[PDB]
Design a protein around this nucleic acid. Structure first.
Lengths: 37, 262, 124, 185
RNA sequence: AAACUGCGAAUGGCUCAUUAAAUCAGUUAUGGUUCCUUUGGUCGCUCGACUUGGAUAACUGUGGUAAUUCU
RNA sequence: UGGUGACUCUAGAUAACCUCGGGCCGAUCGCACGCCCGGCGGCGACGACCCAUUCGAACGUCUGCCCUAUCAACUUUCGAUGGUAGUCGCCGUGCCUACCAUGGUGACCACGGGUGACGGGGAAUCAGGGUUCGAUUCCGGAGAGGGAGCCUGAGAAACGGCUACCACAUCCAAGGAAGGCAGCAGGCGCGCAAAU
RNA sequence: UCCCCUGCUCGGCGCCGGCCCGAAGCGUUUACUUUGAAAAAA
């Protein structure tokens, strides 16, 4: 159960980190857009 | 004194137990458990004065030692175990479930639920903790330590957990517009919608909650329990819906009921 | 002409008994004893007249009404299991040792004075 | 630490002047006309009338459109109209102060039995009530100070276990009947 | 039965002698410490016997003291 | 990594320590029975270094106590005020040491004395304000003749626990032994005053 | 009786990068007055 819980939390944390990185890239692109406009 | 107390007086008791004045000297002091002393309901008090199944204190003990009382999917044999807010009381023999929900006034009430409702439990998270090896930990209001929660769970949020496993199913954020419950003080058991949250550094924060008919009140942040996403509660609400109608409409509806009944 | 009307009827699967409040109408006579109440509840509820246990009969001021409690059990084993002992002694199936508290306390102290096998010897 | 109540109060207030003339005159007139026993009863009725008047005065010093005023004032008015001392045409807060001691003493059970038409006099009415002869809604009353309500006035009659309303005779009738049987036999 | 072990004997009950910023009352803090028990988590995470040892109770037997819940 | 209004917070990595009066890492028990070629299994009890929670306890912060000037100045290397470094304590801190500077309170009543003073929630009287009481069933504090010291236990300076002093006091073959009803009944003394 | 005689970094709640409104952030300090919280039971 320790192995299963660690694997599940690792997968969910990877998904959350990917979503946060996508949000940060969207904010960087919008910052570039407002710098160009 | 020289140690911890072990007795509780009848007059020196919380009023929401709603005991009488002359049948004894001592009150049922609740045992140590998940909930506090003031905001709890013992199994002896509930099973003797609320459901009227037993008559004396021996008979409710004979009920409890037959393993017929279930709390959160677990059999509790303690006669004075503290059953607090949204504790699921299940009877296998008679076949019904209960959820401890406050009504409009400052007291507990008998509120039967479906068995499909009696498989989960809403609970408020208290603090965010990081364990020994960088593992996250979560502390709820009923002291149920949850290992590996979602990173989006913050301090003042709420979660729905599964009773037979002990895992987080889904969660509701704490923001403006969410339906909430007040737990403690003068405003207790009122269902309302959060509209504002004032910030006071170094002291207790205060929020503003609006009722279902335009009424408004204010409580502290520690007395706030979110029960739903928006205007839809996640559980079944008791009769009255926590509206706190004042004494004039109570008198008018009592007169109307006495006229229609006779 | 002594009628019986029931009130607040509620049954327990977890106690294997049915609790109710008995209202007894006996106008023009004294308070009726409990055994005819037991046979009348046996007659109306179609049960043997030995698992019915009634108590707490108070007569109203004026004469004619009597409100009391009574239970109907499923069987004799359940009636022997979860009941107070004094109702069983009233029906005559339980008896206790005829010693006072003073003799028991003095015997306990005298047994506490000694140690060993002679603790049973000094207690007689 | 014993489980008692220790809650009690006095129901009367003694007057300030112990030996006056006119006050003793109307107290004697009230006792003789209503058939009372002592000054404690009329002082008790005066005390409860004074308490009602004091509550009416402290609610009348208050302003209008106050919800607690409207609430317990309507509670007081419905109590005063259900007890039989007020009318529906005078359902106002000031009309409580116009009440008298005659209105409270007229709802006593003694004068209700006397004016109902089944007692010869008011002292005979007190003797009749005290010896368990009447009943109020299938319930006998052994006391004369039973302040009746407006909805319970038309239910007063003789009790079933009484020789006046049909029942077993008393002791002097049976004793004289047994003496007549002995003399005739 | 007895006796070893664990737990409770720090609760409850009685009284107002001392105590005049002392006690206590409302509001606050422990980010300056402890916490039996209950509840929940943790309890093959460490890289190195198919059950070990001898002492004492209860018991048996022999005694002292004028006397102790003595030994 | 994550949080607070704020860390010398939690977590991470590196180098070691790790107390023979010694941290954990199970040589415990009951019931129902078993599957599969000896090995492999469930529902409970007990114990557990820890972390959170619960009953708490403890020390602090702001404000509030009857009378008296025939009490006007008080305290201080026998700590009074503050600073540094330590001991001890479960922790903050003159709580205590060693060295420094002379500080701290007071007419807005310090300090000293008295109280027929346990404090409060409360009670009697009461137009309106006020005056008096609160030993007394609820909450908090103190004590078991009075001071003092301690074992065990998580929690006691415990007294229906122990150890010495004085006052009082029980039994004795005179060498010794044994005590604390301001617990429930009851007795003596006391007094106008209080029950089986 | 009813609306009016405090402003300079992100949104979204709208309109055409801009305006507007709402908010991170702030306004010489007090007493007084009104409301709200908490304020054991008896």
């Amino acid at each position: 159960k320790n192995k299963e819980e660690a694997a599940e939390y690792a997968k969910l944390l990877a998904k959350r980190m990917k979503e946060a990185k996508e949000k940060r890239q969207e904010q960087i692109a919008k910052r570039r857009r407002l710098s160009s406009l | 004194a020289r140690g911890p107390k072990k007795h509780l007086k009848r007059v020196a008791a919380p009023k929401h137990w709603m005991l009488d004045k002359l049948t004894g000297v001592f009150a049922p002091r609740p045992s140590t458990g998940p909930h506090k002393l003031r905001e709890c309901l013992p199994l002896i008090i509930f099973l003797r004065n609320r459901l009227k199944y037993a008559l004396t204190g021996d008979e409710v003990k004979k009920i409890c030692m037959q393993r017929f009382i279930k709390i959160d999917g677990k059999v509790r044999t303690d006669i004075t175990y503290p059953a607090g807010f949204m504790d699921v009381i299940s009877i296998d023999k008679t076949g019904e479930n209960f959820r401890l929900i406050y009504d409009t006034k400052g007291r507990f009430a008998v509120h039967r639920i479906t068995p499909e409702e009696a498989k989960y439990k809403l609970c408020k998270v208290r603090k965010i903790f990081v364990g020994t090896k960088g593992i996250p930990h979560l502390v709820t209001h009923d002291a149920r330590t949850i290992r590996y929660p979602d990173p989006l769970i913050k301090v003042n949020d709420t979660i729905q957990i599964d009773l037979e496993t002990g895992k987080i199913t889904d969660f509701i954020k704490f923001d403006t517009g969410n339906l909430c419950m007040v737990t403690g003080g003068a405003n207790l058991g009122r269902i309302g919608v959060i509209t504002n949250r004032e910030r006071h550094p170094g002291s207790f924060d205060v929020v503003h909650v609006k009722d279902a008919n335009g009424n408004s009140f204010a409580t502290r942040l520690s007395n706030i329990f979110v029960i739903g996403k928006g205007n839809k509660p996640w559980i079944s609400l008791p009769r009255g819906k926590g509206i706190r109608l004042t004494i004039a409409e109570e008198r008018d509806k009592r007169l109307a009921a006495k006229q229609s009944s006779g | 002409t002594v009628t019986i009307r029931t009130r607040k009827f509620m049954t327990n699967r977890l106690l294997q008994r049915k609790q109710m409040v008995i209202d007894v109408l006996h106008p023009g006579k004294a308070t009726v004893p409990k055994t005819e109440i037991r046979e009348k509840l046996a007659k109306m509820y179609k049960t043997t007249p030995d698992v019915i246990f009634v108590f707490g009969f108070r007569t109203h001021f004026g004469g004619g009404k009597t409100t009391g409690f009574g239970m109907i059990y499923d069987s004799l084993d359940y009636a022997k299991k979860n009941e107070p002992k004094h109702r069983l002694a009233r029906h005559g199936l339980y008896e206790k040792k005829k010693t006072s508290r003073k003799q028991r306390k003095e015997r306990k102290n005298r047994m506490k004075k000694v140690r060993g096998t002679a603790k049973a010897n000094v207690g007689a | 630490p014993v489980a008692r109540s220790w809650v009690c109060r006095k129901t009367y207030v003694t007057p300030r002047r112990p030996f006056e003339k006119s006050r003793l005159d109307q107290e004697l007139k009230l006792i003789g006309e209503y058939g009372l026993r002592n000054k404690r009863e009329v002082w008790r009725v005066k005390f409860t009338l004074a308490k009602i008047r004091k509550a009416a005065r402290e609610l009348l010093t208050l302003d209008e459109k106050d919800p607690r005023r409207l609430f317990e004032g309507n509670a007081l008015l419905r109590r005063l109209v259900r007890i039989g001392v007020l009318d529906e045409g005078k359902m106002k807060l000031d009309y409580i102060l116009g009440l008298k001691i005659e209105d409270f003493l007229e709802r006593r059970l003694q004068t209700q039995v006397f004016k109902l038409g089944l007692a010869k006099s008011i002292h005979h009415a007190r003797v009749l009530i005290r010896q368990r002869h009447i009943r109020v809604r299938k319930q006998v009353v052994n006391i004369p100070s039973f302040i009746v309500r407006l909805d319970s006035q038309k239910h007063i009659d003789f009790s079933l276990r009484s020789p006046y309303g049909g029942g077993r005779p008393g002791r002097v009738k049976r004793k004289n009947a047994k003496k007549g049987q002995g003399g005739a036999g």
